[PDB]
Amino acid sequence: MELITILEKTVSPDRLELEAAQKFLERAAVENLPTFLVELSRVLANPGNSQVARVAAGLQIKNSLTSKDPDIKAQYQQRWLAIDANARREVKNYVLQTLGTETYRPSSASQCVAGIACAEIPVSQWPELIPQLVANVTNPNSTEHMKESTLEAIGYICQDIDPEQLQDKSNEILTAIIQGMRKEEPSNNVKLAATNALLNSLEFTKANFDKESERHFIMQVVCEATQCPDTRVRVAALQNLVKIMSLYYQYMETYMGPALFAITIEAMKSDIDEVALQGIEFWSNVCDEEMDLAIEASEAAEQGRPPEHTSKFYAKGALQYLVPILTQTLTKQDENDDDDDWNPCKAAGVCLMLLSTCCEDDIVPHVLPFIKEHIKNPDWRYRDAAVMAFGSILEGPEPNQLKPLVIQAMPTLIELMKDPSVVVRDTTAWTVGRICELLPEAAINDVYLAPLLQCLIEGLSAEPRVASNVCWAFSSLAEAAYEAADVADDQEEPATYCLSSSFELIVQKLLETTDRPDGHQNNLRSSAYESLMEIVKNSAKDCYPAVQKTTLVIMERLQQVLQMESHIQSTSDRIQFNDLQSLLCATLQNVLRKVQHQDALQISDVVMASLLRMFQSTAGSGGVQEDALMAVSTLVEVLGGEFLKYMEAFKPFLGIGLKNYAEYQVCLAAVGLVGDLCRALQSNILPFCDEVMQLLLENLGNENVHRSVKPQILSVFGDIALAIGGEFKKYLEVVLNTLQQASQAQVDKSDFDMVDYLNELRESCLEAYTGIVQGLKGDQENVHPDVMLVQPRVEFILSFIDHIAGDEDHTDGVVACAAGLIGDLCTAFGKDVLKLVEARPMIHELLTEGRRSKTNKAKTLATWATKELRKLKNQA
Amino acid sequence: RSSINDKIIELKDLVMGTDAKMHKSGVLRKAIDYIKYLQQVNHKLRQENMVLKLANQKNKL
Amino acid sequence: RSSINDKIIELKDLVMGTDAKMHKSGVLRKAIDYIKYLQQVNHKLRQENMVLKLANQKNKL
DSSP letter string, A452-485: HHHHHHHHTTS-HHHHHHHHHHHHHHHHHHHHHH
SS3 A622: coil
Q: Which residues of C touch A665 (CB under 8 A)?
A: 21
Q: Which residue of A has its CA nearest to C22?
A: A665
Which chains sit next to B, with 3 or more Cβ pairs under 8 A?
A: A, C
Q: Which residue of A has its CA nearest to B37?
A: A292
Q: Do C33 and A756 touch (CB under 8 A)?
A: yes
Task: Work out the number of other CB atoms within 10 angstroms of the CB of residue A628.
Answer: 25
List the domain range (segments joined by +) for residue C38: 1-61
Taking CB atoms within 8 Å and a gap of at least 24, the contacts of A255-259 are: A255/A219, A255/A223, A256/A312, A256/A314, A259/A223
Distances, alpha carbon A573 to alpha carbons A564, A565, A732, in Å: 11, 9, 51
Question: Measured between CB atoms, which of A295, A399, A437 is closest to B34?
Answer: A295
Question: Measured between CB atoms, which of A665, A752, A759 is closest to C21?
Answer: A665
Q: Which residues of B touch A357 (CB under 8 A)?
A: 26, 29
Q: Report how far Cα A824 is from the mean position of its chain's Cα atoms.
A: 41
Q: Do B26 and A308 touch (CB under 8 A)?
A: no
Question: Measured between CB atoms, which of A292, A395, A854 is closest to B26?
Answer: A395
SS3 A123: coil
Question: Measured between CB atoms, which of C16, C21, C46 is closest to A753?
Answer: C16
Task: Work out the number of other CB atoms within 10 angstroms of the CB of residue A658.
Answer: 23
Counting DSSP H helices and E strands in chain C, the numbers are: 2, 0
3-state secondary structure A549-562: HHHHHHHHHHHHHH
Residue ranges and CATH numbers for the domains of chain A are 1-876 (1.25.10.10)
Calculate how close chain B gets to A357, using CA atoms only, in Å: 10
Q: Do B21 and A438 touch (CB under 8 A)?
A: no
Identify the bridge partners of residue A494 per DSSP, sorted by sequence position.
A489
Q: Which residue of B has its CA nearest to C33?
A: B11
Compute the distance between CA of residue B21 and CA of residue B12 in angstroms, rounded to an integer.
9
Query: H-helix or E-strand containing A421?
Result: none
Q: Do C4 and B38 touch (CB under 8 A)?
A: no
Compute the distance between CA of residue A98 and CA of residue A830 in angstroms, rounded to an integer.
87
Compute the distance between CA of residue A696 and CA of residue A718 in angstroms, rounded to an integer.
13
Query: H-helix or E-strand containing A185?
Result: none
Q: Which residues of B touch A437 (CB under 8 A)?
A: 23-25
Taking CB atoms within 8 Å and a gap of at least 24, the contacts of A631-634 are: A631/A585, A631/A588, A631/A589, A631/A607, A632/A608, A632/A673, A633/A669, A633/A672, A633/A673, A633/A676, A634/A588, A634/A589, A634/A592, A634/A593
Q: Which residues of chain B are at the C interface, by a Cβ-Cβ cutoff of 8 Å? A: 4-5, 7-8, 10-11, 14-15, 24-25, 28-29, 31-32, 34-36, 38-39, 41-42, 45-46, 48-49, 52-53, 56-57, 60
Phi, psi of A340 (to 5 degrees): -85, 30
Identify the bridge partners of residue A489 per DSSP, sorted by sequence position.
A494
Tell me the Cα Rg of chain A.
35
CATH classification at residue C57: 4.10.280.10
Q: Which residues of B touch A307 (CB under 8 A)?
A: none
Q: Which residues of chain A are at the C interface, by a Cβ-Cβ cutoff of 8 Å? A: 303, 305, 665, 708, 752-753, 755-756, 759, 808-809, 811
Interface contacts (B, C; CB < 8 Å): 74
Q: Which residues of B touch A295 (CB under 8 A)?
A: 33-34, 37
Q: Do C41 and B42 touch (CB under 8 A)?
A: yes
The domain total for chain B is 1
Q: Which of A801, A772, A800 is nearest to A787 (CA)?
A: A772
Q: Which residue of B has its CA nearest to A440?
A: B23
Q: Do A811 and C33 touch (CB under 8 A)?
A: yes
A361-383 burial string, b = 16+ CB within 10 Å, else e?
eebbebbeebbeebbeeeebbbb
Q: Which residue of A has its CA nearest to B45?
A: A308
CA A199-A202-A208 angle, 5° bins: 140
| Residue to test with chain B: of C1, C2, C4, most B Cβ within 10 A | C4
Question: Measured between CB atoms, which of B24, B38, B57 is closest to C42?
Answer: B38
How many residues are given for chain B?
61
| Residue to test with chain B: of A295, A311, A402, A491, most B Cβ within 10 A | A295
Q: Which residues of C touch A303 (CB under 8 A)?
A: 46
Distances, alpha carbon A512 to alpha carbons A529, A643, A784, in Å: 11, 33, 59
- Under DSSP, the state recorded for A337 is -
Q: Look up residue B48 and give its amino acid.
A: E
Q: What is the resolution of this structure in A?
A: 3.0
Q: Which residues of chain B are at the A interface, by a Cβ-Cβ cutoff of 8 Å? A: 10, 13, 21, 23-26, 29, 33-34, 37, 41, 44
DSSP A24-75: TTHHHHTTTGGGTHHHHHHHHT-SSS-SSSSHHHHHHHHGGG--SSTTTHHH
Q: Which of A127, A202, A196 is nearest to A170 (CA)?
A: A202
Question: Measured between CB atoms, which of B24, B26, B37 is closest to A292?
Answer: B37
CA A148-A154-A155 angle, 5° bins: 85
